[PDB]
Structures are given as structure tokens and as C-alpha cells.
Amino acid sequence: SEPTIYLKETFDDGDAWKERWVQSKHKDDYGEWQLSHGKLFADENDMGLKTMQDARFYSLSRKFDKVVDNKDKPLVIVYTVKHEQDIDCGGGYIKLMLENTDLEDFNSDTPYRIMFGPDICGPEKRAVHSILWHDGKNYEKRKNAIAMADIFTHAYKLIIFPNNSYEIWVNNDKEAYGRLEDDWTMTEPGSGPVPELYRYKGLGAIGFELWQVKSGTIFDNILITDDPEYAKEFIDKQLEALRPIEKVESD
Numbered sequence: 173s174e175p176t177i178y179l180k181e182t183f184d185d186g187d188a189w190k191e192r193w194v195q196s197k198h199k200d201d202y203g204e205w206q207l208s209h210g211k212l213f214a215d216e217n218d219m220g221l222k223t224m225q226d227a228r229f230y231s232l233s234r235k236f237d238k239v240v241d242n243k244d245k246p247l248v249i250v251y252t253v254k255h256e257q258d259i260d261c262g263g264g265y266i267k268l269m270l271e272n273t274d275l276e277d278f279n280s281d282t283p284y285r286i287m288f289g290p291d292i293c294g295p296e297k298r299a300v301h302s303i304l305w306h307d308g309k310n311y312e313k314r315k316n317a318i319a320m321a322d323i324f325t326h327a328y329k330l331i332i333f334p335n336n337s338y339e340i341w342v343n344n345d346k347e348a349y350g351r352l353e354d355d356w357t358m359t360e361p362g363s364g365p366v367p368e369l370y371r372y373k374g375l376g377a378i379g380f381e382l383w384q385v386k387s388g389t390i391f392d393n394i395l396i397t398d399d400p401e402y403a404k405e406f407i408d409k410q411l412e413a414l415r416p417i418e419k420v421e422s423d
């Protein structure tokens with residue numbers, strides 16, 4: 173069928189991102205954002221979203237193109253993180269919220285449904301957050317996927333299936349998968365059905381709610397869809413030029 177595109181953000185239509193994304197006014201000293209093609213690039217016209225200030229909180233959010241109801245469909249969330257600055261301590265994860273969230277006040281205390289993406293602070297903490305929602309509370313995964321700490325582009329992807337199962341991908345490596353009821357503690361420990369555990373009806377906003385010490389991270393290629401194959405295709409095409417450029421540098 174034809175893939176539903178709940179959100180597609182590639183920051184490539186000039187200044188237009190400034191009318192989609194809202195800078196929260198909850199704090200007066202929020203970190204400041206900018207478009208950039210990065211140190212290593214293929215096209216001096218391929219831009220990502222960049223943190224510009226050290227030792228700051230960030231809070232910038234935006235509505236979906238279309239509100240989500242993943243009842244009886246997959247839900248695919250994917251985007252790219254580039255810690256080109258060689259990050260010491262900082263978040264690189266996104267927050268997914270209900271559609272009627274007040275973006276002008278978005279912050280750490282705002283309710284959210286999913287928190288997903290890398291979090292680095294020293295060489296021990298290298299975790300991919302994977303926080304889901306059930307019955308009024310957020311729940312951390314039991315064993316988080318391991319995050320990338322190098323200076324190159326990494327695609328982080330979360331897939332939720334209507335049989336209450338999930339996958340987590342970093343690039344084309346599937347780091348985690350299984351059942352929602354087992355790999356989290358959203359449910360009572362003994363086995364039993366929670367039929368709509370997978371369901372995120374009304375999901376409609378994405379936000380970067382972050383702290384960074386050494387800033388300079390670039391986010392790009394944000395897709396929220398119901399089509400896992402379109403998501404692999406979309407990322408593969410978006411990074412088609414960049415991947416070899418970075419591979420040359422790693423070797």
C-alpha cells in the first residue's frame with residue numbers, strides 16, 4: 173500500500189524549518205540551533221540541525237505532518253545522529269509526544285510517550301534510550317541497546333509491531349528485538365496479554381530535549397512511517413553519498 177509518512181524532516185528546504193520547529197520559552201538560556209552540513213559532507217547543500225553552545229539545555233519541538241494511530245499497523249521511527257565534535261557528555265535522543273502538546277513550553281518535565289536515541293557521558297555510559305509508555309508512566313527498557321560514540325553518522329531506528337513486538341536498529345545492524353512485555357517492565361512479570369501495549373494513538377510531536385556539554389551534534393533524516401521497507405530505503409538513499417566519504421575517514 174502506499175506508505176504513511178507521519179513526519180519527514182531533512183532540513184533541506186532553506187529557512188523553512190524555522191516555521192515548523194518551535195524553540196521552547198520555558199527557560200531563558202536554552203541552547204541555540206543552526207543548520208550545518210558538517211565537517212565531512214558530500215553536498216555542501218545537505219544540512220542538518222546543529223547544537224551551537226556548550227553547557228546548555230536544548231528544547232526544540234515540532235508537530236507531525238499527520239497524527240499517528242498505529243492500531244494494526246507497524247510504527248517506524250528513524251533518524252540520524254552525528255557527534256562530529258567528539259562528544260564527551262550529551263544527549264542525542266528525541267522525545268515523541270501527544271499531538272496537543274504546548275511546544276512553546278516543551279521541557280524535561282513535559283509529558284512524553286517515547287524517549288529514544290543515544291546518550292553518551294564518558295566511555296561507560298553508551299546507551300540507546302528506548303523508553304516507552306504504558307498506563308500513565310514511562311518505562312526504561314531492561315537492557316538498553318549500545319550507542320555509537322565515534323564522530324560519524326549513525327541511523328537509529330525503532331520499530332513497534334501490532335503483535336506487541338519491536339526491533340531496534342543502529343544502521344543496518346539489528347541490536348535488539350523481542351516482545352514488549354518481556355524486554356521492559358511495563359507489565360506484571362508473569363506472562364500475560366496486554367493487547368494494546370504497542371499502541372501510540374494520538375502521537376503527533378517530536379522534540380529535542382537535551383543537555384550537552386561539548387556541543388556540535390548534527391541531527392538529520394527524521395522519518396516516522398508505517399512502512400519498515402520505505403524506512404530502510406529512505407535512509408539508504410539519504411546517506412548514499414555520505415557513507416563512503418565517512419568510511420574513507422574512518423580507515
Ligand SMILES: [Ca+2]
Pocket residue numbers: 182183184218219220392393
Ligand atoms: Ca538534510
